[PDB]
Write a protein that binds this DNA or RNA. Sequence first.
DNA 1: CGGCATACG
DNA 2: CGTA
DNA 3: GCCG
Length: 327
Amino acid sequence: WMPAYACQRPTPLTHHNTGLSEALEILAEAAGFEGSEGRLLTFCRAASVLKALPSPVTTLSQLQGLPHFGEHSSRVVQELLEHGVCEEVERVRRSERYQTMKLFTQIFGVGVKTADRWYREGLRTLDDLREQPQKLTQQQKAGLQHHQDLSTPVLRSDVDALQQVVEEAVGQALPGATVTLTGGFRRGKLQGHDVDFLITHPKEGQEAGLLPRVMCRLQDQGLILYHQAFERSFCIFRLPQPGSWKAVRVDLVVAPVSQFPFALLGWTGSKLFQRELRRFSRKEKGLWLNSHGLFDPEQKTFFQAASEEDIFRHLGLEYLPPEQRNA
DNA sequence: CGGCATACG
DNA sequence: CGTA
DNA sequence: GCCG
Ligand SMILES: O=c1ccn([C@H]2C[C@H](O)[C@@H](COP(=O)(O)NP(=O)(O)OP(=O)(O)O)O2)c(=O)[nH]1
Ligand SMILES: [Cl-]
Ligand SMILES: [Mg+2]
Ligand SMILES: [Mg+2]
Ligand code: NA
């Protein structure tokens, strides 16, 4: 009753196995810090299966026949069920390696490879990085300066104000261009690490060259604290607060209207949902999916899609609204 | 055992 | 390398 | 780490 791919089942935002999924996601995250993508994937998938269940797991036998639960993930769940704690998970949580890789990778501009190199060099804290700013890219300097504000959740109640401001710049850049809220907030999240906006125009081709024009207008209005022909922009925005403001991460992406359904599907996530959807497409359907389109490598043809609904149908999957893509 | 999503800046 |  |  549980399909193996996350895109084959509804996954709501809130569920009945929160503590169990969070524990497996710690192990997934730690696998990622050690460069083990496959283990990261298995722990993420196992976590996701639990989010999709209709009630709490209370006994080990309820894991029988669930995909992605083998000896390791089952043992994690068993210890949590028996003791309220999994020793392996706690050991990871308090390790200096986990805590520091987590701290470093949280910085905008720093990925696993950079964090790891710094870790091997003996660096442990944000102050360690600040003291040697010679070793930092301009992106990382911005990420580090703004780190405190960027560690504060963006609130859904912030989002409408930002969208209006983006729409104003977009409207001047290209009348008729639209802004669509994507990312976690579109899946119903009440908080986020950033705000993701997808921009298009109803007349195919009119959107060419649009993003630089948008960015120049936003920067002219004094709203851009950081940004770097292009179609994706990862920036840090000045967001008004009572008597002051805070720095917020905002992503902008432009797609032609022909590709909009694919870009909307990709940017709406979740990240695991999209990886599973793409894996499903390729391995089960022999079709190649990305945020631009869906390709049949035998006919050498692209599927036209007018909606996300079209794409789920192309792939032979039941439609899932964004709120059920929280894999 | 091979495979693990797929792009753009 | 970073990023979504 | 797990599946197929
Ligand atoms: O590696 C990625 C990262 C993101 N994405 C897609 C799915 C994800 O939901 C979307 C937005 O990326 P974010 O990093 O902004 N994550 P999300 O908005 O889901 O949550 P949050 O921003 O609150 O962390 O882009 C990928 O496809 N691959
Ligand atoms: Cl691995
Ligand atoms: Mg986001
Ligand atoms: Mg984003
Ligand atoms: Na980072």
